[PDB]
Ligand binder design. Structure first.
Ligand SMILES: Cc1cc2c(cc1C)N(C[C@H](O)[C@H](O)[C@H](O)COP(=O)(O)OP(=O)(O)OC[C@H]1O[C@@H](n3cnc4c(N)ncnc43)[C@H](O)[C@@H]1O)c1[nH]c(=O)[nH]c(=O)c1N2
Ligand SMILES: Cc1cc2c(cc1C)N(C[C@H](O)[C@H](O)[C@H](O)COP(=O)(O)OP(=O)(O)OC[C@H]1O[C@@H](n3cnc4c(N)ncnc43)[C@H](O)[C@@H]1O)c1[nH]c(=O)[nH]c(=O)c1N2
Ligand SMILES: N[C@@H](Cc1ccccc1)C(=O)O
Ligand SMILES: N[C@@H](Cc1ccccc1)C(=O)O
Lengths: 537, 528
């Protein structure tokens, strides 16, 4: 059935594009990967500090994976991230997965809010009474309040995954015009068991929720993203894992697997500038991709380029319908920054604060309302004879990342100095040290703003209210007479996760096989799942 | 007595003007080597007199004025009075919000038309029924915003606050959630008495504002509609660029100074336990003492300053973080000629554009043709090829200031391609005429950390008032355009300086209040 000249052009050598190639290679479908940069992995990006040891790296993008439980053979239980787990096993990486400590493996991480410092779990109110948060709300806590609001939506979506239905999603979409904030302000009413007034929370209380629940401005994005990310993070049993040597090992291993025999050479350093049918009036017209100044023709094209990147590509002759072209612009992205610092020692593990109290932190995270917002201690290498000296001194989202981004990548020594001093000062206040204690231990600094990077043009999809219900489906349909397939993490309900990109590749390849070679569907299903998301042992 | 003014932008310069007029010693601390802040004029090297463009403030919707520079009551009256005070009234030249000749272009969903030609831009294929198309986005948005704006207008006119109280009961709405859960169309529209769908709301945002605007606070939509006059005004710009305004103030102040190239890193009382404790500002590595401090630093900048010993209360410290800012970018291009005025498209039709603007859903979003110099013997050859807000500015920002030629070339090619599609020319027609490109991302600038305040829902009702109270035992006063209801406008910065100086005089020398009122108004906002 399929014409002898079938060849799928895969745009982007990120995890979505590499996964697409892996599926196609397993089905003996020719492909070619076009990559703008000189590296593979995309937002799987591991920075190694040259002056450091083996574990003196940090992941600028993906770094932690909340996988389902697994057996000794690498078989994963059903779960949100099962597809990621099965990929590791497929590549022979299951035993190379090491623990990721979401919470510290020893003493608890720190919380520093409203000038009040405490350990996670100590039950501090962080001066919330002075904010006007009454004692009833404090006793309940932000976590339980948010879970009561998110739980019902999340439970229906879980039932969808388990029972293979879409009613939970249809119900979510009835409320998708809500932001998390507008949901709390105009619809949510506390559970009767809380004993609170049957009234909507005030803005003061809602902002208290956001402060401790997420990041500045998170609640102005879609309520749907809040429930979906709560599901992904498992905030509603997960095995937190990271990759020994950094997440770059995953795309490196895929590239090696595809390259083993002769080699599926990649077209590197070829930025795509145009995608369209050679002749949109001919039904059998092939696709033409202009990348690096050269025209390359393919029967079908699987794009993993971020939506904002597609907006910089000439899509004339790809015949997007009016909804799809609106979707490329309106489907909202979110920002993020990370700042990694190589120190002379893992002071968070062996050091003490200005009063002699030991931090006693191994992995885990600390949280603060200061500009750095989140501090992440490394879980990799903690038990070796050369533990990591590298800290993620700041990991920000939404407004916090937008503001901090102005100090990153300026190219000016004076702003690098301002940035370092701000970060160290924030770190000192979080951990109760002086600035000089941390300055004396600092060796090198590396910082990254995914919202100032031409190859991503944002950290990841972070939809606003209405995006999922109005525009999302349009990009799950192909364009260019069925020959342009949109993929990438934006094309999932697991935005900002590797599984999102993997799901997007499954759906793109499924559509390609469905319209070009249905005889491969059985093997496609057996190797890569009967469904993108619906569970299955 | 000596007031430390942090920031030599228009808010700090205005604060200095007021203090000088009242014989109050002051000192201005400025991080950079320039005054004006977000009044920032870029002149292209090798270009002519009018081959500049304003990277920040560029247009002023002032009230009517007489031959002597007296301005009628209005939102921007305070700005007009500032021009007159500085002897600049006659240096104000017309700014053409719309083209002075043929109308600008609209390019949406691949459909090109002139402003006013009534195109639907393929909206039926988008699922917008004919009734909504016939009414139009402008009338629909005005019907939803009008009631709120009129009550705030009445506040300014009648000297009341009930309009603001009503706005604040609805401040938890974004514009989108207001349309999705509250707004019901006027019965006169003959539409179903139901809330608009997301598809229709996204159609409104597309033609009304920028990508993501409607997810910000409804109050900002109402306030900006008032400021733009979309609910009359004399649109003006400053001959030679907005930089002339701060340059003229600084020159006036230097005759009677400034601490330049001194970035503020710490603000706090010398001894918070002593009542008479002076303020200490650490700038450029040096400690400077003041009786009171007026800060005009943006809120995100204040978050990078050590405010230990300024004794912010818990609401004020929350406000510095949460009160939301918005992004913006501009791209200026020097061409060999004002092709938008003298040229023709690929089919021989003349653009015939003088000033005004064109709009598109393409990445550049907005094109602004210069109004300065149009009638001289050397008209401007400089175009604002792109001016973006919200998501459009966030996305485009990734291509600006990379320092890499390859991305500078990608940016130029995208901008020219978008321009070509908007105006119906070939790419090479514009490339052959391009001389120089300058681009700026106010959301990638340590001195602003965002373009301007652009509050989310709830910010005005929950956190805004806390920063109008002082900190540091009453000796730290917060100012800057964020401390106003005219965000993203010069008048916003001026209002914040009035309130900051007002509070300063109130606690230190109330006998000067009568003269303060006489020279600078009895109220910040209330009309005369
Ligand atoms: C800061 C941060 C942190 C995290 C994460 C992201 C970020 C930004 N994620 C999310 C995860 O990193 C992300 O969802 C996927 O890696 C995205 O893979 P894609 O293939 O969809 O895009 P991705 O962007 O990775 O790949 C696209 C490719 O296209 C290329 N390209 C761009 N423009 C091009 C052009 N014009 N022509 C050709 N090629 C072009 C790029 O260079 C890149 O190689 C994550 N996930 C997770 O599971 N766990 C985690 O802990 C995290 N944490
Ligand atoms: C793109 C764009 C376009 C427009 C506008 C803004 C922008 C970004 N505006 C809004 C207007 O430009 C703005 O509201 C005011 O200029 C702000 O003046 P401020 O004094 O409040 O701040 P502004 O930011 O101007 O001044 C603050 C000063 O503090 C300095 N500073 C920063 N950090 C410091 C530190 N650590 N130590 C010391 N000094 C420090 C800065 O360098 C600067 O000099 C506008 N308005 C209008 O009326 N018409 C218009 O057309 C426009 N258009
Ligand atoms: N998954 C990534 C990024 C992310 C950001 C925001 C929401 C969800 C995920 C993390 O764990 O940090
Ligand atoms: N006042 C500026 C900036 C602005 C942006 C958004 C709203 C209001 C004002 C302008 O006229 O472009």
């Amino acid at each position: 059935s399929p014409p002898g000249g079938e060849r799928v052009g895969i745009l982007g050598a990120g995890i979505g594009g590499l996964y697409s190639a892996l599926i196609l290679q397993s089905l003996d479908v020719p492909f070619e990967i076009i990559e703008a940069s000189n590296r593979v992995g995309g937002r799987l990006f591991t920075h190694k500090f040259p002056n450091g040891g083996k574990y003196d790296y940090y992941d600028v993008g993906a770094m932690r994976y909340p996988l389902p439980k697994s057996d000794d053979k690498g078989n994963y239980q059903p779960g949100v991230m099962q597809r990621v787990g099965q990929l590791f096993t497929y590549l022979g990486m299951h035993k190379q997965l090491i623990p990721y400590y979401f919470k510290s493996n020893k003493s608890p991480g720190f919380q520093y809010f409203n000038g009040v410092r405490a350990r996670i779990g100590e039950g501090s109110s962080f001066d919330a009474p002075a904010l006007g948060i009454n004692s009833s709300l404090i006793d309940i806590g932000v976590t339980k309040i948010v879970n009561d609001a998110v739980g019902p939506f999340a439970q229906a979506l879980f039932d969808d995954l388990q029972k293979h239905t879409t009613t939970g999603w249809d119900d979510m979409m009835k409320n998708d015009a809500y932001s998390t904030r507008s949901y709390f302000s105009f619809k949510y009413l506390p559970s009767p068991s809380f004993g609170l007034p049957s009234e909507h929370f005030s803005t003061r209380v809602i902002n208290w929720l956001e402060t401790f629940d997420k990041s500045t401005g998170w609640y102005d994005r879609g309520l749907t993203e809040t429930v979906l990310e709560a599901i992904a993070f498992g905030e509603v049993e997960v095995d937190w894992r990271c990759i020994d040597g950094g997440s770059h090992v995953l795309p490196d291993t895929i590239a090696a697997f595809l390259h083993k025999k002769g080699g599926n050479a990649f077209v590197m350093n070829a930025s795509v500038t145009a995608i369209g049918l050679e002749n949109p009036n001919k039904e059998d017209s092939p696709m033409v991709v202009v990348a690096g100044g050269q025209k390359r023709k393919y029967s079908h094209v699987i794009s993993t380029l971020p939506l904002p990147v597609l907006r910089t590509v000439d899509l004339k002759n790809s015949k997007l319908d009016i909804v799809q072209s609106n979707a490329l612009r309106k489907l909202q992205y979110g920002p993020s920054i990370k700042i990694g610092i190589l120190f002379k020692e893992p002071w968070w593990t062996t050091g003490q604060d200005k009063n002699g109290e030991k931090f006693d932190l191994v992995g885990g995270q600390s949280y603060t309302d200061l500009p750095i917002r989140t501090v992440v201690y490394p879980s990799y290498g903690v038990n070796t004879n050369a533990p990591s000296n590298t800290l993620i001194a700041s990991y920000c989202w939404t407004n916090d990342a937008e503001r901090m981004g102005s100090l990153i990548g300026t190219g000016a020594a004076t702003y690098e100095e301002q940035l370092e001093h701000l970060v160290l000062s924030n770190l000192a206040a979080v951990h109760n040290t002086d600035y000089q204690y941390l300055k004396d231990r600092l060796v090198d600094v590396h910082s990254w703003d995914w919202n100032h990077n031409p190859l991503t043009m944002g950290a990841f999809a972070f939809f606003g209210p209405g995006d999922f219900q109005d525009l999302y489906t349009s990009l799950n349909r192909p364009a260019a007479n069925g020959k342009l397939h949109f993929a990438g993490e934006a094309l999932s309900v697991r935005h900002a996760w590797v599984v999102g990109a993997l799901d997007s590749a499954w759906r793109a390849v499924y559509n390609y096989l469905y319209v070009t070679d249905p005889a491969k569907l059985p093997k496609f299903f057996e190797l890569w799942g009967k469904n993108a998301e619906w569970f299955e042992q």
